[PDB]
Paper text:
We designed helical heterotrimers with specificity conferred by buried hydrogen bond networks and large aromatic residues to enhance shape complementary packing. Crystal structures of a helical bundle heterotrimer and extended versions, with helical repeat proteins fused to individual subunits, showed all three chains assembling in the designed orientation. We succeeded in determining three high-resolution structures for DHT03: the original base construct, a one-arm version (1arm_A21/B/C) and an elongated two-arm version (2arm_A21/B21/C long). We show that computational design can create cooperative ABC heterotrimers that can assemble as free-standing helical units or as hubs in larger designed assemblies.
The first crystal structure was determined to 2.35 Å resolution. The design model (shown in darker colors) has an overall 2 Å Cα root mean square deviation (RMSD) agreement to the crystal structure (shown in lighter colors) with the largest deviations upon individual chain superposition in chain C. Many of the hydrogen bonds in the design model are not present in the crystal structure, but the overall placement of these residues is relatively close in space to the design model and the ABC heterotrimer still assembles with buried polar groups in the core (water molecules were not detected in Fo–Fc maps, but we cannot entirely rule them out as the overall completeness of the dataset was ~75%). The placement of these residues also appears to be effective in specifying orientation as the chain C orientation in the design model matches that of the crystal structure. There are two possible explanations for the deviations in the hydrogen bonding between the crystal structure and design model. The first is that optimization of nonpolar packing in the actual structure distorts the protein slightly so that many of the designed hydrogen bonds do not form. In support of this, the crystal structure has lower Rosetta-computed energy than the design model due to improvements in sidechain rotamer preferences, Lennard–Jones/van der Waals interactions and solvation energies. The second possibility is that, in solution or neighboring low-energy states, small backbone adjustments allow for more or all of the designed hydrogen bonds to form (Rosetta may not accurately capture the energetic cost of buried unsatisfied hydrogen bonds). On the one hand, the crystal structure of DHT03 shows that many of the designed hydrogen bond network residues are not making hydrogen bonds due to small local distortions in the structure. Instead, they appear to be buried without making any hydrogen bonds, which is expected to be extremely destabilizing.
Residue numbers in the entry:
A (entry chain B): -1 to 76
B (entry chain A): -1 to 72
C (entry chain C): 0 to 75
Amino acid sequence: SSPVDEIDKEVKKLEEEAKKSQEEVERLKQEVEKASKAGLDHEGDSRIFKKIHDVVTKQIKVIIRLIEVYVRLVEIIL
Amino acid sequence: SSPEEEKLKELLKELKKVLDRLKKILERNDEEIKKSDELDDESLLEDIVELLKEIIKLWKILVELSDILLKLIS
Amino acid sequence: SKQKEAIKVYLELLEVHSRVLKALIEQIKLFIELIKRPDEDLADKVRKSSEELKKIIKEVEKILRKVDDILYKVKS
């Protein structure tokens, strides 16, 4: 109902996505370390980078949604 | 409309500009990497360079936006 | 290899962006309470979180410089 309270609700939802992102990042770091300790082909390094690229992209998209919520917070008081 | 509010609205429109171009970069980088098989090292670092530049501009606007908001809310 | 070098950069970005998420969420919550009720202690920890973000900017600029160093040597 209230606009600031709607934003508070949206931040708590994005905060949970951050926690899930960090959990996915920790699973990635374990796989990269396992891939680092193994002799990988140039195609093996390719799939590893593509895996890391997807996690990086997801994480930044969570940041962007946070900022777009942040922007809405600024426009409310204006 | 006051000076400090206009300064915030200018930075807010610059923030929307930065976010828009940042999403275009993420899409282009994702599009270029989805070609699979072997990846060129030069273009990979160049795509990273362009991403880092917008990311740096993004944070700089957030830092300045936080300062203006504290002045407005006092 | 240079593809392993771009892997190290992205892993550095993940650790950096995690602290950007944590700092950005704190600032939004602080402004939510500042808009509902002004408090100098809340404003101080906003300035603290803003200064933390400034140091993160410097870390990302260092990452960028190191990548530019590689690109300059690659294109050489």
